[PDB]
Amino acid sequence: VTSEAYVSGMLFCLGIFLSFYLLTVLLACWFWNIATIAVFYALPVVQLVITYQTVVNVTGNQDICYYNFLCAHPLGNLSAFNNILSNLGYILLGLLFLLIILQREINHNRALLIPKHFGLFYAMGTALMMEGLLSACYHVCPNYTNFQFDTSFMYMIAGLCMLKLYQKRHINASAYSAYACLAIVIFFSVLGVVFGKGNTAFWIVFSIIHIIATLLLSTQLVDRMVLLVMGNVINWSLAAYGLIMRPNDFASYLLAIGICNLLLYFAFYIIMKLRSGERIKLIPLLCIVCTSVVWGFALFFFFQGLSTWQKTPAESREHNRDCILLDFFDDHDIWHFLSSIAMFGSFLVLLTLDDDL
Amino acid sequence: VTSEAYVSGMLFCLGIFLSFYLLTVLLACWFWNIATIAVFYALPVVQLVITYQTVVNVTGNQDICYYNFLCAHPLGNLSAFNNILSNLGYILLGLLFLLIILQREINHNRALLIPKHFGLFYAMGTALMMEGLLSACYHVCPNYTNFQFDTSFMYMIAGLCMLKLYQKRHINASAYSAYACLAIVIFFSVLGVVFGKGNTAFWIVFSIIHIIATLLLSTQLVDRMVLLVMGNVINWSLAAYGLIMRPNDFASYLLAIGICNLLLYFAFYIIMKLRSGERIKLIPLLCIVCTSVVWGFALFFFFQGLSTWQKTPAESREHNRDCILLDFFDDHDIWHFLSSIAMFGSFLVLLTLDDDL
């Protein structure tokens, strides 16, 4: 491809994210526990990517990294520059969550001169920026040994989102455990997935754990009892689909479980708000819809399965598909563009949810 | 070598460590923060070792793992079974630290029916057992990408040892930071060591950091002021030796720094105890000598440099040396046998230090 496509791809990416900065300025005119934990986690992964990428460059063997070889545009020593550039949204849009919460915080403090706790919002903010660093470093050379943290970080942010929801009636102690508990889950998944080919035991044990975990989570949290029963029933239905069909790896299923439960959890809080006399303001109501519709495609684009690290590298090249957007970006890049906006709307639902009170 | 040497090596290893169990029975007749932190750290390292070891077995290329090929005895699919078996002391002798502290704890509770806090001793106990798992897993296939945690864990235990010393006048909050701070130091070392060949900047920046860190540590902690000045002077002398000579990698130096400072820190507490009217009991006085003499050889055996991951694998094979002990164990194995006992005596110095009061 020509260098113009590079310029068009850069201008398109910057144009989308700078439009949110312009919109927030027009509207205005009208802690480190999670950061330290994955700094422990990401850095050993960072070295492996650099070491493996150098091997591919000098050895000539292209069976190491699980790229999208039909559409992967290089620059310098990098083999897929578009896949690294696709995460630019996490940095710019994730940072934009800091100014909006900080602008609220300074307005709150000036005015003083629903519980108010802006600390956890900053934790989600630096969590989204750590996408733009680690998820960029992962894509330099994707591999099984280096896979998990590209999508495991999504769960950490997803869990934190859940924590503030639980903090509706009330944070620091549970945040460390949530990052710590999810770190354990990542490796417990890796241990079972070592024998992933024909892992019938994991197909059953995970379902039993899933049923037990949902009940305990429901128990810890008439309308509530009936509502959690329905959530358990559909959760068992999704697990039954995973146990019966088994069309993708467990890794695809875990991300599928988290987003649907989050959307269910997002929806459920509205049910209490809708059943009660409280009326949802226009902004959260649009935001809930706007967040949900964007999460719709993001799930659709994730289930495409461009590359598979379950099988041999020769078999994974079967699922490569050419660039679709501006002849520079592929389906996984569209996932980054849409998972960034979907998560941005996910926060803005939380920030503006209880403003009516 | 014949299978007898396997039997003699197993009986020798078990005979040494079971002698401590017999001795403790004869004498008697006469939390999870650190555990969770490196479970996050060790497991990604565990996968890399298994993945790399399988590659060596099937590819035939022996340039991946930095073994001691002159003396490395296989069993099953494992390439150096003696190096894995050498860590057996950490499990048996490290576990022995749990019974002695638990036997004291149950005696303390029965009698009740110097501050008493047995929790941190349990943390050191499970730290020593985590040597027997991770340091065993590391030696299955040693490599640069997997190097750090084999000796980085020593620092964590070393730091905890320091914490109880600081707890003389008084724990949980600092333990997490100490493990967290050391996790950062590991990767900050790895980042600089990427350009280790001719890293003149790291040769100077580390010395300045070393000088600043010692002063701040001294400041946080007439006799005290003069004593810390002498400790700083000799610490600057060791750094000056590292900056001038540069005969080994930084990795060898960092372990050298920790043990000497620990022994200095061990010695210094005696100076306050000796200057004061308190008289050291016979057991700690022998234990201080017995711990120190064993740490003497352990430093000597560590500086041998059997394998070097700084250079190419062809150059590292130059420093291989045959088995010395029972035709089964090499110098690094003797390090494991002596670093286990030296650390066991290191704890027993702490446990029995303040019994006279």
Residue numbers in the entry:
A (entry chain B), B (entry chain A): 288 to 317, 450 to 532, 543 to 599, 602 to 652, 686 to 821
What does the paper say about this structure?
Human SIDT1 and SIDT2 are closely related members of the SID-1 transmembrane family, and have been implicated in various biological processes such as glucose and lipid metabolism, innate immunity, and tumorigenesis. Here, we present the cryo-electron microscopy (cryo-EM) structures of human SIDT1 and SIDT2. Both structures reveal an overall architecture of a dimeric arrangement composed of an extracellular domain (ECD) rich in β-strands and a transmembrane domain (TMD) with 11 passes, highlighting the remarkable structural congruence. Importantly, the ECDs of SIDT1 and SIDT2 bind synthetic plant-derived miRNA only under acidic conditions.
Notably, both SIDT1 and SIDT2 exhibit a potential zinc-binding site with three histidine residues within TMDs, which is responsible for lipid hydrolytic activity. Regarding the TMD, while the overall arrangement is similar in both SIDT1 and SIDT2, different transmembrane helices (TMs) contribute to dimerization. In contrast, SIDT2 relies more on interactions between TM2 and TM6 for dimerization. The electron density maps exhibited well-defined main-chain connectivity and side-chain densities in the ECDs, while the TMDs have relatively lower quality and resolution. Overall, while the ECD structure exhibits consistency, the individual helices of the TMD in SID-1 transmembrane family members show flexibility, highlighting the dynamic nature of these proteins in performing specific functions in membranes.
